[PDB]
Write a protein that binds this DNA or RNA. Structure first.
Ligand SMILES: [Mg+2]
Ligand SMILES: [Mg+2]
Ligand SMILES: [Mg+2]
Ligand SMILES: [Mg+2]
Ligand SMILES: [Mg+2]
Ligand SMILES: [Mg+2]
Ligand SMILES: [Mg+2]
Ligand SMILES: [Mg+2]
Ligand SMILES: [Mg+2]
Ligand SMILES: [Mg+2]
Ligand SMILES: [Mg+2]
Ligand SMILES: [Mg+2]
Ligand SMILES: [Mg+2]
Ligand SMILES: [Mg+2]
Ligand SMILES: [Mg+2]
Ligand SMILES: [Mg+2]
Ligand SMILES: [Mg+2]
Ligand SMILES: [Mg+2]
Ligand SMILES: [Mg+2]
Ligand SMILES: [Mg+2]
Ligand SMILES: [Mg+2]
Ligand SMILES: [Mg+2]
Ligand SMILES: [Mg+2]
Ligand SMILES: [Mg+2]
Ligand SMILES: [Mg+2]
Ligand SMILES: [Mg+2]
Lengths: 376, 322, 109, 46, 236
RNA sequence: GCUAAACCUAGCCCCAAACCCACUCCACCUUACUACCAGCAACCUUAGCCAAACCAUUUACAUAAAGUAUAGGCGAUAGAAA
RNA sequence: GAACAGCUAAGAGCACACCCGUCUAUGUAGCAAAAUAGUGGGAAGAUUUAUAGGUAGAGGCGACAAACCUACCGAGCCUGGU
RNA sequence: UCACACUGACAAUUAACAGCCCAAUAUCUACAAUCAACCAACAAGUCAUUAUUACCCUCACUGUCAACCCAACACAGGCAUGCUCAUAAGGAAAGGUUAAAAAAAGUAAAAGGAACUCGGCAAAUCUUACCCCGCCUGUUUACCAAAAACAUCACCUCUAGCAUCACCAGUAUUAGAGGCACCGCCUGCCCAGUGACACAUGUUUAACGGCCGCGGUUAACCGUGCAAAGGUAGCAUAAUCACUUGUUCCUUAAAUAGGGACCUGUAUGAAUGGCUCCACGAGGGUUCAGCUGUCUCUUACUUUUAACCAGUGAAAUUGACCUGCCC
């Protein structure tokens, strides 16, 4: 089955005049005139090429001519890359362990609700003029309000002033598996930076013991399946800042996912996979900026967090990169899926049920505050 | 049908027209870590933040002016929390529309089937600030109720339709930052920013060099008036039921380098002729000239930085609500 | 639905009115999400000279003499500019790389 | 019902049906315009 | 007479292509088939009828995996997207094909028979005698065309030399080459003929206008014709 | 006597002779009366009313020869040339 | 793309806006070459509708009225054969 | 010059309201909307990019009026979107005098409340039983017939082994051409004739269509002739030629009206579909309690109308008329 349809494709041109097949006179064509003519023969114009370059009407060369056209097709990854399997694909591409439970230090750092409820109600109903808002409206608003609520505790911890939450921040990182080349790209949300690096959660004992278990395969599905295959990518890594910039080390990737429609969302499993991939890429970029580009085992492992999206459902991911040589030891990540703060909200009164959220739990806010603290 | 008032306008000498439509009183003047943080926030978007896509002149105010201002406001709110505890529990809305509706004066139909009938012309300000702060409690009064200040108000001896200000019909909205069912209804400071249209370079290219500060003054006046009117209507007050207490407000404007501050003091809400013949009160709106925050930036280093602007920003953000 | 009214920008609906218009000669182009860019090169720059010391007036006096009309043509111009042609015993063959070309109206008035 | 209103006004449909371009697109409109010109009408098309 | 066919998509895309209904109209504008038009909007999904087709730099067999089983509005039988390797492709779903199942796609004609599951596919030269099959192709590398509706399934009769006679669901014998590929089992969406419509609302939603009102006088073609089976048509 | 009729110049038709017009400025093939950007365009027996009381054959769109030879359900009608 | 209040609870019932027009009485140069007030069926669906394109007479369409196709369609109008 | 929106000159409307649109190479768009978070489905669905090449010249153009459109008009005719379902907006049924006759829109009734009329037809009291047709809902002659017809889901007949322009981007549970029309009993005979399928002297009837006559014993039954079969079940004077106001009971005191059982129905009848059946039809009839001036027997009142005063001001029609009755 050939997809195309002859009627939709470009119509085949008419047959050349029988006068050109005579070797070799001058076929009297209408080239002398500047308009279509029915009688007389049809000429064969040459391929015209514009002398000057017009940005409004500029044609790019083909793929066979480029400055860095490589033969090894590297598969890049971005926010739009919707995975297929789920978290297992991200774990295989990153080579890290999956722990179903947050660390002990973060949970212990915890040791109020009216403010959170008011902020939720505001962002969900009162933050706009019209009724029944949309995800694209209250998702970034919810994220910003939560960040502000978490940062308002600077009076208690004076060390929370040495950080900032930027917006348009990107990153890049390249690594090999067995043995193709991969690549990642920046995000499209927020990003919290810190002056000093985060502390090491897991010790070297766990890093050495992780050599026992292995990765989880998924035959016959390949780790690419959904990753974007794109040539001409430039392997030269890059970050979102330049040398000598305050607050260089990251802390928590506050990426969001707008989209008012369900099909335009990223799903929980695929969103967690994308978050893990982004955290691994940021950690690798930070390691390459601190150390060299050689493949070896790092001595001072870094830590990069990330929070889920969606005003209702929420996810947590605490990455911990300790080795740059993939191809040995591996990393470990702590996940907390399907946390979801408040179950449902009733913008209008149904006829029975008041105007407000239902099914709220404070553990989500406590975990958010603990993740925001960590270093303070 | 009501005149669609735009705070960010480009008309000439629109300050007098706005003062007449609002009945205000303008008055010139006012009633180490922070500097480093501001310089870092600047240099960030000015050089450090590697832009994937090449930014042009039209995509500058929307990619380097808004994020930098947002980061500056966030850093200020975070650093001023210990000294100002009222800012910790404050609600900050990033990019939220501000609407307000009111009536002013009368107007007889010139031609049509409605000729010979009094039609009170209406107005509406649909401001869209970049980010504002909200506090449950109200700000102090600064200026007492009912002030003399003998400076008169512009007259405007012509139809208001002459100035590029046309009429349009749509849903009348009176919105501050949230709905009436919210405790965080009051605020204090407000931030704005003009687009590539109202650029001082564009005004210098033409001959409207004297309108540079006038545009900022009119925008600040419109924003403050809309804010105060909407927040007073949220409390139940309106034309007939005049406000019993003043609704002071503050707003800061800029364009990318020059900064200036403006104050306000809402005194009355009855702008119609039915309650203006015996209304000796009037609103006030303080202001200052535009000063440059920094001369230029070389690669990754400020040149002539200014500390007075930062000091004024700190003084404006540290005002505690009584 | 008259057939005598000249079709202008005050007849068609919103789309027609927006697309059509008067013969005012556009300046620049339109790109992006409704972002018209003005090209300074296409803007008509009026070269106005200095009128200081201009002893001429837009009205002639009645005391001037009457003379016959002499249609200036190529032959008259060549006869007037014949000094170097006779002294020899200034012409361009191709004006493709010329700024103010003759046959192709590249200038304006 | 009242069938006296058989004409629905619309400039787009009028210009698309009795348009100069639609007329010249086929010899029908060409002959129509030629006849209208030979007759001497002031308005040839809509 | 502006009539452009929406079937304009060279690249095999997975997203539902916007289907522009026809209503029985041809390129001119006249109706040639009554009873088509006025239905609910639908979106066609590019189906990959050709079961066997390796990806880039590939040749040998390759396994597959089922992800989900969705419904197709353009046909009676449901579908189920299956991912194989570094790409995906919509294909027809078989009976008892749950999510996560493994589908084998090979083309090597083994010496003996191969016990095929209820989803995999192998050439007719490696199928036991008397086995229900569907999505049979006409020529080597042509594409599935026969037996593709809901519940339809043809049984394998016998093999003669390098050919194989397939008993189509219509009790008609068809000789197909042995090197051709064809799925096994019956198509999903069982008990479809028993699906009672209930009301004309669903009939109109499906996109079927009511029949004409002319009282056609039944002629000679209305009588029952007890015809025998037709001769076996081959493609060799 | 109120309402109402009277005025030839404009112009046209029939002929002789001769072969007539088509860029002050700008637009004119898309929504003609629009300054400014990447597609195939025509070469086809005319039919029919009518007449033969209807109609199916058939019927036209210089002078003389001569309406002669001829065709015509051998009829209404057609119809030349040397 | 838009439309469908409200009440009792499924191409459910009543009922706003809206689509259609079974009867009464006025008129047939009438307001109207198909109108006026009430009594009526539908009104979450096979429904109505704003925009544009396509199907035209030796035909198109038709939940068939052999009905409709710009006020007269058992088959339209205008040009020449009239 | 109903009365004074009719002539020549005077200038508004200023866009920010919506359009005027995206330079290419290739590659990613499967987990609906219905407060979308539980359930719950079917009609399977309305909004999103990637690396590179080249580009940092920027605020021009179209409408901004009104009592407005389409119907020969200043026409009781038609017109969608957001807001209020009587308002902050939107208008004057009465040019003056009288109550002629008649007509239309309404108000009240001593007594009956369908006895007037072919008919419970405008009127409000307001709801019940028995029959015909159709399954419903909807569509049907725009503009006299809006149904008992057209259609509808169920049933069944015939044709096709199949890719690029509708069918179809489909594959004998599919597509095309058709009779009737769910559910219950069900649908009995036939190719003599026409047509179709045949190439096997045949099959097809849920194709077009047809399913006996005579004498004897109201009748089992007997003999005879024709033919492929001689009307099967059912139902009944029906929506059913004439006989026919059929026989008979009820329904009115008064019944060619209606319902209940019978067929000499010689011309009813089983997908030309026959008989029952819980829902429903502005489809067609009867009827028990209540009624409304339809009547017995009508009147009084308000408005338009009606009569005089002022003006604009006509149609169809007219042979001229000095325009009667009886035989
Ligand atoms: Mg049918
Ligand atoms: Mg039928
Ligand atoms: Mg004749
Ligand atoms: Mg209903
Ligand atoms: Mg109803
Ligand atoms: Mg009929
Ligand atoms: Mg005649
Ligand atoms: Mg207007
Ligand atoms: Mg009319
Ligand atoms: Mg009046
Ligand atoms: Mg009167
Ligand atoms: Mg009475
Ligand atoms: Mg009676
Ligand atoms: Mg009587
Ligand atoms: Mg009645
Ligand atoms: Mg019916
Ligand atoms: Mg219809
Ligand atoms: Mg009718
Ligand atoms: Mg109708
Ligand atoms: Mg009717
Ligand atoms: Mg029927
Ligand atoms: Mg039968
Ligand atoms: Mg009878
Ligand atoms: Mg009776
Ligand atoms: Mg009905
Ligand atoms: Mg009079």
């Amino acid at each position: 089955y050939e997809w195309g349809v002859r009627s939709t494709r470009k119509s085949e041109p008419p047959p050349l005049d029988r006068v050109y097949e005579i070797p070799g006179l001058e076929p009297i064509t209408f080239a002398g005139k500047m308009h279509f003519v029915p009688w007389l023969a049809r000429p064969i114009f040459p391929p015209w090429d514009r002398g000057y370059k017009d940005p409004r009407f500029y044609r790019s060369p083909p793929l066979h001519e480029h400055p860095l056209y490589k033969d090894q097709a590297c598969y890049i990854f971005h926010h739009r890359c919707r995975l297929l399997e789920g978290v297992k694909q991200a774990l295989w591409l990153t080579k890290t362990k999956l722990i179903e439970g947050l660390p002990e230090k973060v949970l212990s750092l915890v040791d109020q609700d009216e403010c959170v409820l008011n902020v939720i109600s505001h962002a969900r109903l009162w933050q706009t003029t019209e009724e029944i808002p949309k995800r694209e409206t209250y998702c970034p608003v919810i994220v910003d309000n939560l960040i502000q609520l978490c940062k308002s505790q600077i009076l208690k911890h004076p060390s929370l002033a040495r950080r900032i939450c930027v917006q348009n921040s990107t990153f890049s990182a390249t690594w090999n598996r067995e043995s193709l080349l991969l690549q990642v790209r920046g995000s499209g949300g927020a990003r919290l930076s810190t002056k000093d690096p985060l502390p090491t959660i897991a010790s070297r004992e766990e890093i050495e013991a992780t050599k026992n278990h292995v990765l989880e395969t998924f035959y016959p599905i390949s780790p690419i399946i959904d990753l974007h295959e794109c040539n001409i990518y430039d392997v030269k890594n890059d970050t979102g800042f330049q040398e000598g910039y305050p607050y260089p080390y990251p802390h928590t990737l506050y990426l969001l996912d707008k989209a008012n429609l369900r099909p335009h969302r990223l799903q929980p499993d695929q969103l967690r996979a994308k978050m893990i991939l982004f955290a691994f890429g940021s950690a690798l970029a930070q390691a390459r900026l601190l150390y060299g580009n050689d493949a070896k085992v790092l001595e001072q492992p870094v830590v990069v967090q990330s929070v889920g999206t969606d005003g209702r459902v929420f996810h947590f991911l605490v990455f911990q990169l300790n080795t740059t040589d993939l191809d040995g030891v591996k990393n470990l990540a702590w996940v907390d899926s399907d946390q979801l703060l408040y179950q449902h909200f009733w913008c209008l009164p149904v006829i029975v049920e008041p105007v407000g959220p239902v099914g709220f739990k404070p553990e989500t806010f406590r975990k958010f505050l603990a993740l925001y603290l960590h270093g303070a | 049908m009501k005149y669609m008032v735009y705070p960010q306008t480009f008309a000439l000498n629109a300050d007098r027209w706005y003062q007449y439509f609002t009945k205000t009183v303008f008055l010139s003047g006012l009633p180490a870590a922070l500097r480093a943080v501001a310089c870092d926030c600047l240099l960030q978007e000015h050089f450090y933040l590697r832009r994937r896509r090449r930014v042009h002149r039209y995509e500058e105010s929307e990619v380097i002016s808004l994020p930098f201002l947002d980061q500056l406001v966030s850093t200020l709110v975070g650093l001023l929390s210990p000294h100002n505890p009222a800012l910790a529990a404050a609600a900050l809305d990033y990019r939220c529309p501000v609407h307000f509706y009111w009536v002013r004066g009368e107007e007889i139909i010139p031609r049509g089937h409605r000729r010979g009938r009094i039609d009170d012309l209406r107005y509406q300000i649909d401001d869209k600030p970049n980010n504002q702060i909200r506090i449950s409690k109200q700000l102090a009064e600064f200026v007492p109720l009912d002030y003399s200040v003998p400076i008169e108000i512009p007259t405007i001896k012509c139809k208001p339709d002459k100035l590029p200000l046309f009429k349009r019909q749509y849903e009348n909205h009176i919105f501050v930052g949230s709905k009436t069912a919210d405790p965080c209804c009051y605020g204090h400071t407000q931030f704005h920013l003009l687009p590539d249209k109202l650029r001082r370079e564009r005004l210098l290219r033409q001959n409207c060099a004297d309108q540079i500060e006038v545009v900022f003054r009119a925008n600040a006046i419109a924003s403050l008036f809309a804010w105060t009117g909407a927040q007073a209507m949220y409390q139940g007050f309106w034309s007939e039921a005049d406000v019993t207490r003043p609704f002071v407000s503050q707003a800061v404007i800029t364009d990318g380098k020059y900064f200036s501050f403006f104050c306000y003091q809402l005194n009355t809400l009855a702008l119609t002729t039915q309650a203006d013949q015996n209304n000796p009160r009037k609103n006030i709106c303080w202001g200052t000239q535009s000063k440059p925050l920094y001369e230029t930036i070389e690669d990754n280093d400020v040149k002539g930085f200014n500390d007075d602007v930062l000091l004024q920003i700190v003084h404006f953000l540290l005002n505690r609500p009584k | 639905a008259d057939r005598m009214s000249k079709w202008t920008s005050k007849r068609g609906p919103r789309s027609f009115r927006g697309r059509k218009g008067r013969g005012a000669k556009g300046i620049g182009f339109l790109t992006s999400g409704w972002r018209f860019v003005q090209i300074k090169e296409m803007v008509p720059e009026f070269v106005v000279p200095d009128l200081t010391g201009f002893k001429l007036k837009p009205y002639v006096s009645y005391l001037a003499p009457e003379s016959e009309e002499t249609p200036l043509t190529a032959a008259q111009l060549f006869s007037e500019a014949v000094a170097p042609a006779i002294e020899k015993d200034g012409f361009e063959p191709t004006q493709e790389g010329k700024l103010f070309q003759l046959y192709p109206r590249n200038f304006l008035r | 019902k009242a069938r006296g209103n058989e004409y629905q006004p619309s400039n787009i449909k009028r210009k698309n049906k009795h348009g100069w371009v639609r007329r010249l697109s086929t010899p029908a409109g060409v002959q129509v315009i030629l006849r209208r010109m030979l007759k001497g009408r002031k308005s040839l098309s809509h | 007479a502006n009539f452009v066919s929406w079937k304009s998509r060279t690249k095999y895309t997975i997203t539902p292509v916007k289907m522009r209904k026809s209503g029985g109209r041809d390129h001119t504008g006249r109706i040639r088939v009554h009873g088509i038009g006025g239905g609910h909007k639908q979106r066609y999904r590019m189906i990959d009828f050709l079961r066997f087709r390796p990806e880039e730099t590939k040749s040998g067999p390759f396994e597959e995996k089922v992800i989900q089983v969705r419904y197709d509005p353009c046909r009676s039988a449901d579908i189920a997207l299956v991912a194989g390797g570094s790409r995906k492709r919509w294909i027809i779903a078989t009976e008892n094909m749950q999510a996560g199942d493994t589908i084998l796609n090979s083309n090597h004609i083994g010496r003996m028979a191969v016990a095929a599951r209820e989803g995999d596919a192998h050439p007719l030269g490696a199928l036991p005698v008397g086995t229900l099959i569907n999505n049979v192709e006409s020529e080597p590398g042509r594409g599935a065309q026969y037996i593709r509706a809901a519940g339809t399934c043809g049984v394998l009769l016998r093999k003669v030399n390098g050919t194989a006679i397939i008993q189509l669901p219509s009790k008609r014998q068809m000789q197909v080459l042995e090197t051709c590929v064809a799925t096994v089992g019956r198509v999903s969406n069982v008990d479809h003929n028993k699906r009672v419509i209930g009301k004309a609302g669903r009939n109109r939603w499906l996109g079927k206008r009511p029949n004409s009102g002319r009282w056609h006088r039944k002629g000679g073609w209305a009588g029952r014709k007890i015809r025998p089976l037709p001769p076996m048509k081959s493609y060799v």
